[PDB]
């Protein structure tokens, strides 16, 4: 072929050479430069016909190579002219010709005339190339233009500019060769953010990029860089906060000219999070640090270094003699924070140290050097065991930089905990010195001269044969000599024996025949905080070893109270999560369980219930599954062990966070039997109730009307097996819709009221007619028979007022596990008895004996009986009677009110600050002994059955604390039943003070008010009675100003008089101001700082958010009025709310209102419509250029209408930025059922795009159905605007955005729905949207 082409195109050249040399011969009337060129390629036309399409590209590549091989520009132009006519006449495809002309390696910018002639030819024929091929040629042409240097000759510019005209032709919107979005995509790929356009192009491509500046705004969240989250390490993570681990930049969709701040690293965002306690999990999720390899993330590594420098800066400037007030608080946080990232190999200690040296070299004074070395000592002392020595040597350069070398550094006052920070430098050197002695030679490390006094003090104290706890001399030795074989048994063993109590007599525990070791004083927190992580690691390991040792020794002596108290305090440090928390549930718990210790196992579960705090959700689910398998088998048929297992599980289930429930239980859909109960109906009901509020608070079902398909169907369907039950109407009506639809079907028949009464009387008649004890015991304790014995005991002491000796033996044979069914049926029987009863003595006799069965005979505990009563399915008056029985049991006798009054008055819930809990614990049990083995029954029986069952260790719990989780459930049942309103007020008056010892009081109020907004909106006094009683129980245990605002304490704390307190705008500004200042970090601070390791919240912002939501829900003001008042804090000109910082306020309002019930945050839809109908969007006064200031809240505005229009868009973005996907699912219907019929102008259409546009990506990832509904709504609005407007001025930004939505999101999903909408648009819109249907 190529030889044929050679002969053909040689004739073309040879024929033109003789025509150039002899003109005017055969040109009498030729065609105007058409037939000549066509006839020249006549031989090539016949040759091209006999070629397959496979040979076409090879033939054109050869022709281009033959034209580019010519030397005469006059001949190249002629051949190009022949080629141009071949494309015009349809003989040659334009794309292949353009591709071959531009890809030619002979085409160089130095070939100054071939360059111009080539691109002049491209300019003629490129118009006939399809839009995808034009995009391909756009890339290579811009690449060839990039090969031209910045300095060239002046004479060749006009010839080089021939390529600029092709770029000008491709970028011509009126030419419409390709979607303009394609063109700006290829331009930004070669000229990204930061690069300057080539001099040959210049203003051409720079102005074309600026035409997509509006589209980038439509797809950007206003003020996103200043939007900050509240750190909750709970359910998954929002994709809005994820960052590029290599650049710290947001992942942006498309190559658009987004604002400059969106291309910058989000240091302020990452810095704010790292400063917060328990941000460890959220920092990993942002940067994708899911533990894959030695990450060595330098942007995180450098940000940790900047956070250390910031702690050094705040170390200066006052802070005075006592404490730090921040600074020492930040160093404390830096201590535990940086350990994780270096331990799991995300930050490198040697690189951090030398990078810290450069940052600290010549940067002013150095006052926080000891705290810096204390932070660094945590890395060295804990990891130098096996890491190479060369990784810790850079510390030597830091020491020489921060300390005075000449004179001795004196020994500090070892009575203060700050001595461990002063000795931290010498401790670091002792670890470096021992790493240099172990495996000697090469490089020995000498101690400095300035640290000679600190070292002599540590060695002279190490040879002291008996060291005390009266100072920190012991902690200094544990910190310094932790990595020494025999030099660590001297200090470590000195503080392990002080809590073990090996000798010096024993001590009793509650009940009978239960003894523990002598020591009761645990190691204080300021001592444990003074220990290094390595020193605490050995303490954790030595305590767990002795427990396992005591567990295998089959010993009946209990662990010392100081041991379990100290071990619970060491379980606080999450930097020791490997040996502490993970080992407690995965190693110590199974080991104790496999050894049949029971006693020790009872201590570990009791320690968990009363001494844990910030446990990760997956760890709680692990313990929960262990509790279920522990209760079902292993024959744990002991009264005290079954009560402990069932009580501990109730706390885990009830305390699960709303956002934590789905991600932890969605993992067990394959086999939900592991995380459920097989016989405890109450626990399974408690889990259903916890699903109810978790799906409610997270708005999980908002949008879906069926539980099927979700994770809840397999959890609930399995719960119907094992423990089938019904739900009363007043409780079922509060569940989310799809949950009710699951319980209306899957309905269980219930034994009627008459059949229970008839069964109890027939069995009590049999009891009075039988004499053989063996027949009585076999019958009334038969497994599988109706559980009526508690009803029988009720019948016995109701008539005869006493119980036979067989009555105790029958209970003893039933067992603790099988007895809950008897309590369950006895609860129903109690309801029938009280519901069908005459008043007077006949009713007061039932109350008298019902208390006797609890307190006199000890047949069932108060919390076991009331939990069963509150977990019944009675309706109407029967339910009123059931709750009336609960009120009687609690308030009528003196047995429980005295226990609660004395326990609250004499005890404090801060166990971590207490050194005498066991004493105050024994004083209660010695005053109100609890009988857990039917002692009262066996003691007052006809021949007193002597009982000697040994009790298991009880270190913390009692009946008052065991009832507090059930009290949470009792309150919810009373709120659901309207006639039982008044009795709930009496409970909170008498027993409300018990919430002093609640573990999550603010969280409980938050869920209660949020879940029961419908039942408390029109009962404000009850809502105030609840909030004031629970928060009021902590007034003497938490600082003033910790929860309720100063205004709420001065106005909403008075009696009602047909004039509730209606807060003004000043109130809501101050209330929101407490959150904006807490998230900003203030040295005084709106709230007092608490040890977040022992609080229900992880950090100040999490605490500031919930107490604000709780207070707003406690107001006697509707959700609509409160929600609008929140929006008016920013959307109306308000003092005390300073502008220039309005995004921090919009961020807080978004966080606050998105956590409130729907009647609160729904008002945003009303506020948008008021802007949609505003004169700024409804007027027809035209602009020149895009009205950026109508949508940019930072620009200057000409009208108040423009100001509120932009502020509304900015606030609507902040609100939707923090909204759950369930709350965002209302937007498609909000667009189609509210905005669609009123959006008629072009500015209204753009305002809708600016509203929803930025959140398209969230619908792409989280709920796809909405993304399509929104996409069609945008086109439906475009057709309405197109039909109501005579003309449209901004059709290019509208179509650019619609193209961006296609290629980035909708793709080809919406094609037929959109195409029919396109066909009714005006032709100007159709030509721009020519490629949308492709």
């Amino acid at each position, epitope marked *: 072929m190529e030889t044929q082409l050679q002969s053909i195109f040689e004739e073309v050249v040879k024929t033109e050479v003789i025509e150039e040399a002899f003109p005017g011969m055969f040109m009498d009337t030729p065609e105007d430069e058409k037939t000549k060129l066509i006839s020249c390629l006549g031989a090539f036309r016949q040759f091209w016909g006999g070629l397959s399409q496979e040979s076409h590209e090879q033939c054109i590549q050869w022709i281009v190579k033959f034209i580019h091989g010519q030397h005469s520009p006059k001949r190249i132009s002629f051949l190009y002219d022949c080629l141009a006519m071949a494309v015009e006449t349809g003989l040659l495809p334009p794309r292949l010709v353009c591709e071959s002309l531009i890809n030619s390696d002979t085409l160089e910018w130095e070939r100054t005339q071939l360059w111009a002639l080539t691109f002049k030819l491209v300019r003629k024929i490129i118009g006939g190339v399809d839009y995808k091929g034009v995009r391909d040629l756009l890339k290579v042409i811009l690449e060839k233009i990039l090969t031209i240097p910045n300095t060239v000759s002046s004479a060749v510019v006009q010839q080089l500019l021939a390529a600029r005209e092709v770029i000008a032709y491709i970028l011509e919107r009126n030419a419409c060769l390709l979607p303009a979005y394609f063109a700006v995509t290829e331009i930004r790929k070669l000229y990204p953010e930061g690069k300057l356009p080539h001099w040959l192009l210049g203003n051409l491509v720079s102005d074309f990029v600026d035409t997509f500046r509006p589209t980038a705004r439509i797809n950007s969240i206003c003020g996103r860089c200043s939007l900050l989250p509240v750190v909750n390490n709970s359910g998954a993570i929002c994709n809005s906060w994820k960052l590029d681990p290599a650049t710290l930049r947001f992942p942006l969709k498309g190559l658009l000219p987004y604002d400059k701040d969106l291309f910058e690293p989000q240091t302020a965002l990452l810095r704010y999070v790292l400063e917060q306690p328990y941000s460890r999990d959220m920092v990993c999720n942002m940067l994708g640090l899911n533990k894959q390899h030695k990450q060595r993330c330098p942007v995180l590594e450098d940000q940790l270094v900047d956070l250390v420098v910031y702690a050094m800066e705040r170390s200066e400037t006052e802070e005075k003699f006592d404490d730090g007030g921040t600074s020492q608080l930040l160093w404390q946080h830096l201590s535990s924070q940086l350990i994780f990232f270096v331990l799991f190999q995300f930050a490198s200690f040697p690189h951090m140290v030398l990078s810290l040296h450069q940052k600290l070299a010549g940067r002013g004074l150095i006052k926080g050097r000891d705290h810096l070395m204390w932070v660094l000592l945590q890395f060295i002392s804990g990891s130098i065991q096996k890491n190479a020595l060369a990784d810790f040597l850079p510390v030597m350069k830091l020491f020489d930089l921060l300390y005075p070398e000449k004179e001795y550094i004196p020994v500090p006052d070892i009575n203060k905990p700050q001595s461990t920070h002063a000795f931290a430098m010498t401790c670091i050197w002792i670890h470096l010195n021992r790493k240099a002695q172990n495996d000697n030679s090469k490089l020995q490390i000498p101690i400095p001269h300035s640290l000679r006094l600190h070292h002599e003090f540590l060695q002279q104290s190490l040879r002291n044969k008996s060291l005390q706890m009266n100072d920190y001399k012991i902690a200094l030795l544990c910190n310094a000599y932790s990595t020494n074989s025999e030099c660590f048994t001297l200090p470590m063993g000195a503080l392990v024996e002080t809590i073990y109590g090996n000798g010096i007599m024993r001590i009793p525990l509650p009940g009978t025949n239960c003894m523990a070791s002598g020591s009761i004083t645990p190691l204080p927190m300021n001592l444990l905080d003074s220990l290094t992580v390595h020193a605490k690691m050995s303490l954790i390991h030595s305590i767990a070893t002795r427990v396992i040792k005591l567990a295998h020794a089959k010993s009946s002596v209990a662990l010392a109270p100081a041991l379990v108290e100290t071990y619970s305090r060491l379980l606080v440090y999450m930097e020791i999560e490997s040996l502490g928390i993970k080992g407690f549930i995965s190693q110590l718990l199974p080991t104790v369980f496999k050894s049949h210790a029971w006693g020790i196992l009872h201590t570990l579960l009791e320690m968990f219930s009363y001494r844990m705090h910030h446990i990760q959700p997956h760890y709680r689910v692990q313990l929960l599954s262990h509790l279920h398998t522990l209760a079902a088998v292993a024959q744990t048929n002991q009264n005290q062990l079954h009560l402990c297992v069932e009580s501990t599980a109730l706390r885990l289930i009830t305390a699960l966070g709303s956002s934590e429930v789905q991600p932890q239980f969605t993992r067990f859909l394959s086999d939900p039997k592991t995380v459920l109960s097989a016989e405890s109906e109450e626990l399974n009901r408690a889990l259903i109730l916890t699903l109810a509020r978790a799906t409610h608070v997270t708005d999980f079902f908002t949008g879906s009307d069926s539980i099927q398909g979700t994770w809840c169907k397999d959890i609930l369907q399995t719960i119907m097996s094992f423990t089938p039950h019904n739900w009363a109407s007043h409780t079922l009506s509060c569940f989310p819709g799809p949950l009710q639809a699951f319980f209306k079907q899957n309905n269980v028949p219930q034994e009627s009221r008459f059949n229970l009464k008839k069964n109890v009387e027939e069995e009590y008649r049999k009891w009075k007619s039988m004499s053989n004890e063996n027949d009585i015991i076999t019958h009334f304790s038969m497994q599988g028979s109706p559980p009526l014995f508690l009803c029988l005991l009720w019948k016995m002491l109701l008539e005869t007022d006493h119980i036979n000796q067989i009555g105790y033996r029958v209970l003893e044979r039933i067992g603790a596990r099988a007895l809950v069914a008897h309590v369950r049926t006895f609860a129903d029987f109690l309801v029938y008895e009280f519901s069908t009863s005459a008043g007077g003595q006949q009713l007061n006799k039932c109350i008298e004996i019902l208390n006797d069965m609890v307190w006199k005979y000890n047949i069932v505990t108060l919390d076991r009986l009331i939990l069963c009563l509150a977990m019944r399915s009675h309706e109407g008056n029967e339910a009123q009677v059931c709750y009336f029985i609960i009120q009687l049991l609690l308030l009528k006798p003196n047995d429980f009110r005295n226990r609660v009054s004395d326990f609250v008055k004499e005890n404090s819930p801060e166990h971590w600050l207490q050194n005498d809990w066991h004493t105050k614990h024994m004083n209660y049990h010695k005053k109100y002994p609890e009988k857990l083995y039917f002692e009262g029954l066996a003691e007052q029986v006809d021949p007193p059955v002597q009982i000697q069952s040994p009790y298991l260790p009880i270190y913390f719990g009692n009946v008052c604390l065991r009832f507090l989780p059930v009290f949470d459930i009792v309150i919810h049942r009373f709120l659901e039943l309207l006639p039982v309103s008044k009795s709930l007020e009496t409970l909170l008056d008498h027993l409300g003070g018990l919430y002093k010892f609640h573990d999550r009081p603010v969280t409980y109020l938050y869920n209660t008010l949020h879940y029961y907004e419908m039942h408390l909106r029109d009962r404000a006094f009850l809502k105030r009675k609840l909030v004031h009683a629970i928060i009021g129980s902590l007034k003497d245990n938490r600082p003033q100003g910790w929860c309720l605002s100063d205004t709420y304490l001065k106005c909403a704390m008075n009696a009602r008089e047909e004039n509730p307190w209606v807060p003004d705008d000043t109130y809501y500004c101050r209330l929101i101001g407490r959150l904006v200042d807490t998230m900003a970090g203030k040295s005084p601070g709106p709230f007092p700082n608490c040890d977040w390791r022992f609080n229900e919240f992880p950090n100040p912002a999490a605490h500031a958010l919930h107490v604000t939501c709780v207070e707003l829900m406690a107001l006697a003001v509707s959700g*609509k009025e409160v929600g609008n008042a929140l929006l008016n804090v920013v959307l109306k000109s308000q003092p005390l709310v300073p502008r220039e910082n309005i995004t921090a306020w919009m961020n807080a309002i978004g966080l606050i209102i998105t956590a409130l019930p729907e*009647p609160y945050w729904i008002v945003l839809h009303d506020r948008i419509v008021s802007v949609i109908s505003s004169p700024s969007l409804t007027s027809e006064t035209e602009w020149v250029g895009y009205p950026f200031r109508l949508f940019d809240f930072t620009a200057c505005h000409q009208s108040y209408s423009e100001m509120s229009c932009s502020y509304t868009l900015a606030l609507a973005h902040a609100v939707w930025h923090h909204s759950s996907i369930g709350q965002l699912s209302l937007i498609p219907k909000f667009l189609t059922e509210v905005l669609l019929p009123i959006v008629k102008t072009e500015f209204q259409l753009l305002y809708v795009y600016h509203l929803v546009g930025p959140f398209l990506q969230r619908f792409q990832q989280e709920r796809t159905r909405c993304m399509i509904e929104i996409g069609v709504a945008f086109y439906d609005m475009l057709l309405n605007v197109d039909q109501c407007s005579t003309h449209l001025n901004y059709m290019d930004p509208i179509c650019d955005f619609l193209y961006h939505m296609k290629y980035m999101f909708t793709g080809d999903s919406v094609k037929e729905q959109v195409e029919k909408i396109i066909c009714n648009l005006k032709p100007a819109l159709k030509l721009r949207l020519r490629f949308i249907t492709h």
Partner: nanobody
Amino acid sequence: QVQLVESGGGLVQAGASLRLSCAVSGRTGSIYTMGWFRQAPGKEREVVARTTWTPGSTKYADSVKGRVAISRDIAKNTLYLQMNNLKPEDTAVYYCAACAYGTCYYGDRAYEYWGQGTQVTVS
């Protein structure tokens, strides 16, 4: 607490019109959406028309689509239901209901406050 009192029903011939009114009283401002419902003698209560209170966005059921207009007067605290071209199948007791949730309007959440109703019998 929010009280509602329907009014304006009675016996009307087929094809004629009727203008129901609802006297909204009590704690107005707690109301985000309001609607009209109806219930035949032996059938389940259906929804007729719903409105968002302050903006006035309307939403109509497919059974009465095109024949019915729902409106409100915030100043007079009154909800209106204009029913035109009445058919015999429209014989029912008509209730006005309010609700504080947007999902009452968008979805099918039950309304919270109710009136006793008014009889509309179209022969």
